[PDB]
Structure 1
Amino acid sequence: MHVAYEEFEKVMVACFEVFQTWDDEYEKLQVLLRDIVKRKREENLKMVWRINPAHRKLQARLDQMRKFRRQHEQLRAVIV
């Protein structure tokens, strides 16, 4: 809340990189788990995963926190 707008840009970019890395590596992981289940097909009759990652709440919340700031700071500079 107290840091500058641009420092917040940089921190937000780093956090977004973290989220994207999670998504990519989890997609590769899902490829692997699909293959291992399929090879041992008889072992698993139901292959659903339905993975609710916990930080999805944090990710969506932070994303709302971004758009709020960017729209607002743009508004404050313009209206002045």
Structure 2
Amino acid sequence: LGTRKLMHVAYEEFEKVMVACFEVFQTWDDEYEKLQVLLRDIVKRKREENLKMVWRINPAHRKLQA
């Protein structure tokens, strides 16, 4: 965002950059859910306990997404 000079472009280029930002975010969400299901079946195949594992993750990108 620093090297983008985003506060001066038109809505055409800014719209393309906007869509690309949401592209990256959606890659994060769906692939992260695939990694979630991945770890779910990992914990199932290991069969260890019923810990209170926190999946309420607030990462470093939603801060800008909102």
TM-score by length of 1: 0.65
Q: CA deviation at 1:43?
A: 5.2
- CA gap of 1:21–1:15, structure 2 versus 1, over 3 A, is same
Counterpart CA distance in 2 for 1:45 and 1:39 is 15
Give CA deviations for 1:24-75 in whole Å, capped at 9, x if unaligned: 100000000011012212156333322211111111xxxxxxxxxxxxxxxx
* Structure 1 stretches of 4+ moved >3 Å: none
Larger relative contact order (CA 8 Å, sep ≥ 6): 1
Counterpart CA distance in 2 for 1:17 and 1:43 is 37
TM-score by length of 2: 0.77
Counterpart CA distance in 1 for 2:8 and 2:53 is 47
| Residue ranges of structure 1 left out of the alignment (5+ in a row) | 60-79
Q: Which has the larger radius of gyration?
A: 1
Aligned partner of 1:21 in structure 2 is: 27
Relative to total residues, which structure has the larger helix share, 1 or 2? 1
Counterpart CA distance in 1 for 2:42 and 2:50 is 10
| Alignment: residue pair count | 60
User: How much identity, in percent, do the aligned residues show?
Assistant: 98
